Amino acid sequence: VTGIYVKYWIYVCAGMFIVVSFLVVYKIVYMFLFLLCLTLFQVYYTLWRKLLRVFWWLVVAYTMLVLIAVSELFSSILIPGFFLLACILQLHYFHRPFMQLTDLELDLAASFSAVLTRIQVFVRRLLELHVFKLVALYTVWVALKEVSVMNLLLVVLWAFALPYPRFRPMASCLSTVWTCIIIVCKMLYQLKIVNPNWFGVRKGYPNLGYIQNHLQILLLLVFEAVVYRRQEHYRRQHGTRQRLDQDLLSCLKYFINFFFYKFGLEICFLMAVNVIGQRMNFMVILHGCWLVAILTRRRREAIARLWPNYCLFLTLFLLYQYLLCLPPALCIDYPWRWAIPMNSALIKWLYLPDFFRAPNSTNLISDFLLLLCASQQWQVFSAERTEPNPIPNFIHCRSYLDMLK
Instruction: Report the alpha-carbon distance of residue 355 to residue 338 in Å, rounded.
Output: 11
Q: Are 17 and 31 in contact (CB under 8 A)?
A: yes
Please calculate the CA angle 144-148-152 and round it to the nearest 5 degrees.
70
Helix, strand, coil % over all residues of the chain, rounded to 5 = 70, 0, 30
Residue 84: how many other CB atoms lie within 10 Å? 18
28: three-class secondary structure by DSSP = helix
Residue 47: how many other CB atoms lie within 10 Å? 19
Report which secondary-structure segment, H or E, holds 30.
Answer: helix 25-44
364: left (phi over 0), alpha (psi -120 to 50) or beta: alpha
Among 149, 209, 139, residue whose Cα is nearest residue 175: 139
Q: Are 372 and 275 in contact (CB under 8 A)?
A: no
Encode burial over 148-184: b for 16+ CB neighbours within 10 A, e otherwise: bebbeebbbbbbebbbeeeeeeebbbebbebbbebbb
CA atoms within 13 A on the CB side of 141: 11
Among 314, 369, 295, 309, residue whose Cα is nearest residue 141: 369
Question: For the chain, how many residues are written?
Answer: 405
Instruction: Report the alpha-carbon distance of residue 395 to residue 358 in Å, rounded.
Output: 58
Report which secondary-structure segment, H or E, holds 18.
Answer: helix 10-20
Distance between start and end Cα atoms, the chain:
52
Q: Resolution limit in angstroms?
A: 4.1
Method: cryo-EM
Q: List helix spans (H) across 280-363.
A: 282-295, 300-325, 344-349
Instruction: Report the alpha-carbon distance of residue 131 to residue 223 in Å, rounded.
Output: 8
Instruction: Report the alpha-carbon distance of residue 404 to residue 395 in Å, rounded.
Output: 10
Report which secondary-structure segment, H or E, holds 254.
Answer: helix 248-279
Gaps after residue numbers in the chain (C–N over 2.5 angstroms):
22, 70, 105, 196, 238, 326, 338, 386
405: three-class secondary structure by DSSP = coil
Residue 99: phi and psi, rounded to 5, are -65, -40
Q: Are 93 and 101 in contact (CB under 8 A)?
A: no
Instruction: Report the alpha-carbon distance of residue 313 to residue 319 in Å, rounded.
Output: 9
Task: Report how far Cα 184 is from the mean position of its chain's Cα atoms.
Answer: 20
Q: List helix spans (H) across 183-208.
A: 185-189
